Amino acid sequence: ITGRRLEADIFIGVIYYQRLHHMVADKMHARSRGPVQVLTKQPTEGRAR
RNA sequence: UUUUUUUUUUUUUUUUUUUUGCGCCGACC
C-alpha cells in the first residue's frame, strides 16, 4: 500500500500447503422455519433436512 | 247339584360449505 521498504527482513519460502475438505460452502446452515419432528413438534436435525 | 280377572285420543324435512427410531464408523471445535 505505502510502497516503502519494510523495516525488517521478512522470512519467505515455499511451503507445501494442502486444502482440506472442511469448506464453508458445505458448512453454512441457516434455518428460520420449516419441517418439524412428528413426535415432539420440534425442529429437525441436519442441514440436509 | 257349582267357586276366585280385566278394557279406549296431542312432537315437523325425504337432506347440506410435510422420513421416525436403532446401532456403527469417520471427523471438527
Strand partners, A36: A43
Q: B10 C1' – A39 CA distance, angstroms?
A: 58
Q: Report CA dihedral (A46, A25, A16, A3) to the nearest 10 degrees.
A: -140
Long-range own/partner contacts, residues A30-36 (CB < 8 A, 24 or more apart): none
Q: Which residues touch A48 (CB under 8 Å, ≥6 apart)?
A: none
C-alpha cell at A6: 519494510
Q: Which nucleotide is nearest to A33 (CA to C1')?
A: B18
* CB < 7 A to strand B: residues 19-48, chain A: 22, 34-39, 44
Rounded Cα–Cα distance for residues A28 and A43 (Å): 17
Rounded Cα–Cα distance for residues A47 and A24 (Å): 13
Method: cryo-EM
* Documented resolution in Å: 2.2
Q: Which nucleotide is nearest to A34 (CA to C1')?
A: B18
